[PDB]
Amino acid sequence: VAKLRYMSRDDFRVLTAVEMGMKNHEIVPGSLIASIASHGGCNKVLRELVKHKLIAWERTKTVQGYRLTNAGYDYLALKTLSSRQVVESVGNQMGVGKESDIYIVANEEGQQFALKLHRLGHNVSWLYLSRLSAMKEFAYMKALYERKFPVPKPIDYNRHAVVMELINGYPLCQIHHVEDPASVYDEAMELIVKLANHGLIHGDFNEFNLILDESDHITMIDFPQMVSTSHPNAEWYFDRDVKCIKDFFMKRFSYESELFPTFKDIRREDVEVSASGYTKEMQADD
Amino acid sequence: VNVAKLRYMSRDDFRVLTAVEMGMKNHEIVPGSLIASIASLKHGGCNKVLRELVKHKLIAWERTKTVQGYRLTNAGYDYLALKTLSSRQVVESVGNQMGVGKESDIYIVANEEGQQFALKLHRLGRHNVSWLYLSRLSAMKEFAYMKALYERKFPVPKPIDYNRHAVVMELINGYPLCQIHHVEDPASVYDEAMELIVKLANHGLIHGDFNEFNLILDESDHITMIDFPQMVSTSHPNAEWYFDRDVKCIKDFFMKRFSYESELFPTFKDIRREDTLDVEVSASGYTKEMQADDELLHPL
Numbered sequence: 001v002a003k004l005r006y007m008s009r010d011d012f013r014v015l016t017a018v019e020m021g022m023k024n025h026e027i028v029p030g031s032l033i034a035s036i037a038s039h040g041g042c043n044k045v046l047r048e049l050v051k052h053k054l055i056a057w058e059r060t061k062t063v064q065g066y067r068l069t070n071a072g073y074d075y076l077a078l079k080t081l082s083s084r085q086v087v088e089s090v091g092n093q094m095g096v097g098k099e100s101d102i103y104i105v106a107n108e109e110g111q112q113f114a115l116k117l118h119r120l121g122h123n124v125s126w127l128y129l130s131r132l133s134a135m136k137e138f139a140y141m142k143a144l145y146e147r148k149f150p151v152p153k154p155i156d157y158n159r160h161a162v163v164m165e166l167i168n169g170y171p172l173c174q175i176h177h178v179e180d181p182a183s184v185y186d187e188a189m190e191l192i193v194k195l196a197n198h199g200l201i202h203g204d205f206n207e208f209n210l211i212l213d214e215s216d217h218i219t220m221i222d223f224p225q226m227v228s229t230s231h232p233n234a235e236w237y238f239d240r241d242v243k244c245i246k247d248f249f250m251k252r253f254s255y256e257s258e259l260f261p262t263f264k265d266i267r268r269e270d271v272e273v274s275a276s277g278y279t280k281e282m283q284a285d286d
Numbered sequence: 287v288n289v290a291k292l293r294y295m296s297r298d299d300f301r302v303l304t305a306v307e308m309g310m311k312n313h314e315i316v317p318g319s320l321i322a323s324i325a326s327l328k329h330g331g332c333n334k335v336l337r338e339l340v341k342h343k344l345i346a347w348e349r350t351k352t353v354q355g356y357r358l359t360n361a362g363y364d365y366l367a368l369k370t371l372s373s374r375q376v377v378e379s380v381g382n383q384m385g386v387g388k389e390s391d392i393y394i395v396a397n398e399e400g401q402q403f404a405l406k407l408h409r410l411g412r413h414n415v416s417w418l419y420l421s422r423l424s425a426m427k428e429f430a431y432m433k434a435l436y437e438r439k440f441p442v443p444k445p446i447d448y449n450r451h452a453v454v455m456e457l458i459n460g461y462p463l464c465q466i467h468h469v470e471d472p473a474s475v476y477d478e479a480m481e482l483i484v485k486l487a488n489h490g491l492i493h494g495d496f497n498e499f500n501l502i503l504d505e506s507d508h509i510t511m512i513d514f515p516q517m518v519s520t521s522h523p524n525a526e527w528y529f530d531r532d533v534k535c536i537k538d539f540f541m542k543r544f545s546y547e548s549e550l551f552p553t554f555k556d557i558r559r560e561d562t563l564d565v566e567v568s569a570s571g572y573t574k575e576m577q578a579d580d581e582l583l584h585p586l
């Protein structure tokens with residue numbers, strides 16, 4: 001774990017100005033950055049930001065200027081989170097999600113958490129989609145957590161960063177021995193039904209998104225592109241997830257079952273409404 | 287096939303409908319005062335227009351303890367795109383819906399001469415502001431990749447034009463593979479799908495949703511790819527899993543529907559990398575241009 005690097009308020013203002021300019025521009029010219037930040041002082045700051053790899057300079061035939069980098073975007077989110085006493089130090093990357101990088105972080109007291117940094121996207125698409133990708137995850141984690149789903153407890157959010165409870169477990173893909181394979185297989189299958197019961201289909205249900213703890217309990221850590229059960233082709237997505245689970249257990253643990261669930265028999269009984277509500281609340285702030 | 291020309295709308299009404307769209311970019315719900323400012327009608331019958339737009343179900347109004355205002359509806363968003371396409375002579379009439387994509391509704395449309403095309407209307411974002419942007423983005427990505435894939439001789443429809451969340455493309459004379467119950471040579475059709483997966487992987491892409499619903503079969507039993515919403519790069523950390531999943535879906539369908547099995551299915555290791563500037567790079571270039579042109583970035 002390493003403490004965040006120091007930065008002056010002036011440098012932070014320019015870095016923030018690059019981000020603001022990037023909302024509607026693929027490339028931000030030095031002149032615009034100066035206008036937003038409020039000019040050979042500005043150029044000094046830009047030169048320092050390039051050296052630190054927080055921003056990058058680019059030349060194209062139509063326009064030339066700067067853009068935020070992954071590191072620069074990360075710094076904005078982490079500093080904001082640092083200011084809220086949520087994250088003070090960041091460790092190394094332990095893995096990835098479909099659209100994200102996962103890290104370990106610690107607060108002031110040294111209490112550890114999981115940090116997910118979302119990367120999705122074009123420069124303007126990248127800034128917008130990464131932020132949106134994170135918001136959706138935080139919103140859905142919160143909604144799923146309220147209904148006692150096996151997901152981490154969400155702690156905080158900013159931009160493309162999400163901070164959640166850290167599960168003491170490993171991805172199912174790295175697990176080669178389990179106490180009872182039928183037991184874990186059933187937990188996963190029951191999980192798929194429970195999501196369908198609440199109107200959701202994962203769409204990426206696999207050994208990579210499922211984490212197994214010491215007690216062999218499964219926790220869902222990635223849900224980027226879930227499908228509604230109201231979708232015209234919802235059955236196919238449901239069946240695909242089930243087959244993926246069956247495939248993995250046959251390959252890894254040599255376990256088979258003929259009790260595969262069916263989509264039509266699934267009934268409904270709400271997370272999407274709550275999650276959309278949470279998404280709307282968060283959007284008001286940004 | 288019932289194709290109907292769009293209903294007429296006055297310049298004033300279109301201006302207000304356009305104003306709601308502009309307002310929706312910064313507001314989940316758009317207040318009336320803001321719409322008037324944006325529309326700026328010379329004589330100020332703004333409230334008159336909005337209620338008619340509400341009556342025609344093009345927009346909807348809401349009040350909450352915290353906020354109140356208007357929002358575009360699916361029909362209203364559709365009207366802006368179609369009216370725009372109509373003025374540019376791309377499409378004059380719209381038929382019935384013939385099917386769906388992962389994030390879209392597919393329709394039949396016709397131009398002035400009565401020539402038919404396929405129209406896709408993208409719906410994504412079930413928040414109001416995300417709905418406005420994501421639908422545009424979904425349409426833009428689709429047009430951009432269709433263009434990039436088509437120029438490289440991929441079996442995809444020819445993209446004609448786009449606006450907002452709408453994409454207009456060549457209409458393929460075929461039906462989705464899920465609806466096909468008899469084929470002259472299933473082995474041959476199976477080969478087309480597998481070759482398509484290899485060709486996409488060779489160009490740095492994995493479909494991620496490769497299925498009977500996304501593949502169209504024509505009169506000569508040729509396959510066309512009509513929906514590719516969330517493709518994965520071959521450089522993705524778990525790309526091999528996604529590649530295999532798509533292959534298994536194809537194998538599964540053919541065993542169930544045609545009782546056909548084969549052992550000549552591709553492997554991820556065999557994939558090659560062509561020119562660095564491949565489909566993704568070309569598609570990204572198109573995406574940047576369309577984003578620059580987006581009407582939200584310019585005055586009315």
Ligand SMILES: COc1ccc(-c2ccc3[nH]c(=O)c4nnn(-c5ccc(N6CCNCC6)c(C(F)(F)F)c5)c4c3c2)cn1
Pocket residue numbers: 094095096102104114152164165166167168169170171211221
């Ligand atoms: C929400 O909590 C979590 C916990 C673990 C993970 C996660 C996700 C994908 C991973 N992919 C890998 O290839 C991998 N290799 N080691 N590894 C992993 C798993 C658990 C853990 N620990 C988690 C905290 N208790 C000690 C074990 C570590 C760590 F020790 F480095 F922190 C690394 C992962 C991984 C973890 C995600 N969220």
Ligand SMILES: COc1ccc(-c2ccc3[nH]c(=O)c4nnn(-c5ccc(N6CCNCC6)c(C(F)(F)F)c5)c4c3c2)cn1
Pocket residue numbers: 287384385386392394404443455456457458459460461462502512
């Ligand atoms: C890009 O070109 C196309 C063409 C067809 C399609 C498409 C996609 C999903 C569909 N799902 C359905 O349940 C369905 N039922 N009929 N139907 C269909 C297929 C081909 C066609 N035609 C295509 C043009 N020549 C005459 C047949 C029609 C039409 F009669 F309405 F034009 C309807 C579809 C469908 C088409 C998509 N893109």
